[PDB]
């Protein structure tokens, strides 16, 4: 909160109005794009915010989750390449820049070790079932 | 149609395998979460689609099938899993895949 507050003061309330959600996700992710594990410098996010998008971890078609637990800040190209897949389906592909094993190790440390992310977000990111299956979509609807 | 082994990851009891089936204009990606070690180490590619996989992710066929986004060398399925492991063993070690 203090780091976000310092960012708002230096950036100005006008620029803080439109990018506060991306700034919060950037702070939550320690400046990292979660799908590529590449650095997102704060100055580039503030100057070129359109190069970074808010991806929904599990597609809302299946998840019905528009909360912060289902949102991550990623590079524009990573959001494009992922499509309507889970991170597991995307990172196991040939379209990803990092392995799912590297991704999983980072996510587990981000949740258990650093506590930066919620338990709900961690389970979204490490979802390894086929979200296109009848049974899996049923489980997502029934968890509500 | 050409089938490529695009990604692999060694697990405790098997291998995670990703295969892209490419024809003239379509790429169909098959995610095999768990393939038994015995099938992998013996290059029993004819048994690969006997095992559970996610529904294929369908996208436009790529203009090039050389290396995946991680940097692993993509091999054709008929060349065998051992070929993929031989060419990418060191890189897979650095990405926690071996
Ligand atoms: Ni914006
Ligand atoms: Ni907000
Ligand atoms: Ni700055
Ligand atoms: Ni959808
Ligand atoms: Ni919704
Ligand atoms: Ni969260
Ligand atoms: Ni947790
Ligand atoms: Ni079933
Ligand atoms: Ni083939
Ligand atoms: Ni099946
Ligand atoms: Ni290439």
UniProtKB/Swiss-Prot annotation, chain A:
Positions of the HNH Cas9-type domain: 1-144
Q: How does it assemble?
A: Monomer. Binds crRNA and tracrRNA.
Enumerate the active-site residues: 56 (proton acceptor for hnh nuclease domain)
Known role: CRISPR (clustered regularly interspaced short palindromic repeat) is an adaptive immune system that provides protection against mobile genetic elements (viruses, transposable elements and conjugative plasmids). CRISPR clusters contain spacers, sequences complementary to antecedent mobile elements, and target invading nucleic acids. CRISPR clusters are transcribed and processed into CRISPR RNA (crRNA). In type II CRISPR systems correct processing of pre-crRNA requires a trans-encoded small RNA (tracrRNA), endogenous ribonuclease 3 (rnc) and this protein.
Task: Give the recorded effect for residue 79 to A.
Answer: Target DNA not cleaved
How might one describe the protein's use in biotech or industry?
Coexpression of Cas9 with an artificial sgRNA which fuses crRNA with the tracrRNA in human cells has shown it is possible to target and modify DNA sequences of interest. The smaller size of Cas9 from this organism (1053 residues versus 1368 for Streptococcus pyogenes) makes it easier to package the gene in an adeno-associated virus for delivery to 5-6 week old C57/BL6 mice; 2 different target genes were modifed as desired.
Record remark on domains:
Has a bilobed architecture with a recognition lobe (REC, residues 41-425) and a discontinuous nuclease lobe (NUC, residues 1-40 and 453-1053); the crRNA-target DNA lies in a channel between the 2 lobes. The NUC lobe has 2 endonuclease domains. The discontinuous RuvC-like domain in NUC cleaves the target DNA noncomplementary to crRNA while the HNH nuclease domain cleaves the target DNA complementary to crRNA.
**Family of this protein:** Belongs to the CRISPR-associated Cas9 family. Subtype II-A subfamily.
**Name of this protein:** CRISPR-associated endonuclease Cas9
């Amino acid at each position: 909160n203090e780091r976000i507050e310092e960012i708002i003061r230096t950036t100005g309330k006008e620029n803080a109005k439109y990018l506060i959600e991306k700034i919060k996700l950037h702070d939550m992710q320690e400046g990292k794009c979660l799908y590529s594990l590449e650095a997102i410098p704060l100055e580039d996010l503030l100057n070129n915010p359109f190069n970074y998008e808010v991806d929904h971890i599990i597609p809302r078609s299946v998840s019905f989750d528009n909360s912060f637990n289902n949102k991550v800040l990623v590079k524009q190209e990573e959001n494009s390449k992922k499509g309507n897949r889970t991170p597991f389906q995307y990172l196991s592909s040939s379209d990803s820049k990092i392995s799912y094993e590297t991704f999983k190790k980072h996510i587990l440390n981000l949740a258990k070790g650093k506590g930066r992310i919620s338990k709900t977000k961690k389970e979204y990111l490490l979802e390894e079932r086929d979200i296109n299956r009848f049974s899996v979509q049923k489980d997502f609807i029934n968890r509500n | 149609s050409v089938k490529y082994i695009s990604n692999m990851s060694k697990q405790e009891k098997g291998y995670r395998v990703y295969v892209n089936v490419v024809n003239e204009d379509t790429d169909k990606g098959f995610l095999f979460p768990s393939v038994p070690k015995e099938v992998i180490e013996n290059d029993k590619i004819d048994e690969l689609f006997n095992f559970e996989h996610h529904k294929p992710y369908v996208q436009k066929a790529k203009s090039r099938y050389d290396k995946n986004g991680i940097g692993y060398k993509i091999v054709q399925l008929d060349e065998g899993f051992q070929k993929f492991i031989e060419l990418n063993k060191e890189k897979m070690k650095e990405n926690l895949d071996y």
